[PDB]
């Protein structure tokens, strides 16, 4: 029925995102993980899953230059919110050396405001907790 779609690059797929997906799953929230490193050819199957997801969670590679990454990988994910206007989008800037300002600027330009960030003071576990709580609040919303 109702579910959540997590989007990310491959480098975090098997680490941070797996914890994120496990946490939602413990909380009884079905979810699927889409890898955006795939080109637009195999990605055509994944477009289907994102579109019917109630909550779309974008886990961004925050250590990287947004100009070298957004259009190439995540534009296609954000463009699934058009088809489903009920869908809400959550954004995560994940990384141990964030280009914080460059990314905040990119997210503003695309019109995204619901934002979570890596911080040196908090564990990735705490970060996951904060995201699960946000999703849950949005999930029945």
């Amino acid at each position: 029925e109702e579910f959540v779609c997590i989007s990310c690059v491959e480098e975090v797929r098997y680490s941070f995102v797996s914890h994120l997906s496990e946490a939602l799953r413990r909380k009884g929230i079905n979810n699927v993980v889409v890898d955006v490193d795939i080109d637009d050819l195999l990605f055509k199957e994944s477009q289907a899953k994102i579109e019917k997801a109630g909550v779309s969670v974008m886990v961004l590679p925050g250590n990287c230059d947004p100009s070298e990454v957004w259009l190439d990988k995540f534009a296609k994910v954000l463009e699934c919110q058009r088809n489903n206007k009920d869908q809400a989008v959550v954004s995560v800037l994940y990384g141990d050396s964030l280009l914080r300002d460059q990314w905040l600027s990119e997210l503003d330009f695309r019109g995204l405001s619901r934002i979570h960030q890596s911080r040196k003071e908090c564990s990735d576990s705490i970060l996951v907790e904060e995201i699960v709580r946000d999703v849950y609040e949005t999930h029945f919303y």
Partner: protein, 166 residues
């Protein structure tokens, strides 16, 4: 004294903030009492650490690239090794993003840091043998294609089993 204690032995603030933070959250979720290593070598007294290890029932020895930079961490492993030989604790080697043979034979970046830290130290040989023997205990592997969340669940399972068995 606490007596369903699991000792988590490792080094690295980055490892503490990431993978270990999930492992710790899952153990607490299952009401298992854990003791976290002095991962920064912020100087918890060595005798307190070695005593905590001895009071444990389980030790998770998480080998990462930074394990061999710390003389204190290597002393902890020696203590691990000594205690298993007297049978007071179950030890589970965890290989975080390195191959076990790398640990066993002190290869690559892992051994270079070891050799640098132990240069001209009398206890070098005894330490060398511990690294050669601890990876023969069954243990758990985490490589870059491993699903970490699954590995966390796998470790927690091993701990539950070991605790029922005591």
């Amino acid at each position: 004294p606490p007596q369903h204690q699991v000792f988590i032995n490792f080094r690295g603030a980055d490892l503490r903030r990431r993978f270990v933070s999930h492992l710790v959250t899952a153990l607490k979720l299952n009401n298992i009492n854990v003791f976290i290593d002095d991962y920064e070598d912020r100087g918890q007294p060595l005798d307190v650490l070695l005593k905590r290890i001895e009071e444990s029932k389980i030790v998770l020895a998480i080998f990462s690239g930074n394990y061999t930079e710390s003389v204190w961490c290597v002393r902890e492993l020696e203590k691990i090794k000594d205690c298993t030989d007297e049978g007071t604790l179950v030890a589970i080697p965890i290989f975080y993003k390195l191959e076990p043979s790398t640990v066993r034979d002190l290869k690559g970046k892992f051994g270079d840091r070891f050799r640098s830290m132990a240069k001209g130290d009398e206890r070098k040989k005894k330490w060398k043998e511990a690294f050669n023997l601890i990876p023969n205990i069954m243990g758990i592997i985490i490589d870059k294609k491993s699903v970490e969340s699954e590995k966390v669940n796998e470790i927690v399972k091993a701990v539950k089993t070991a605790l029922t068995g005591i």
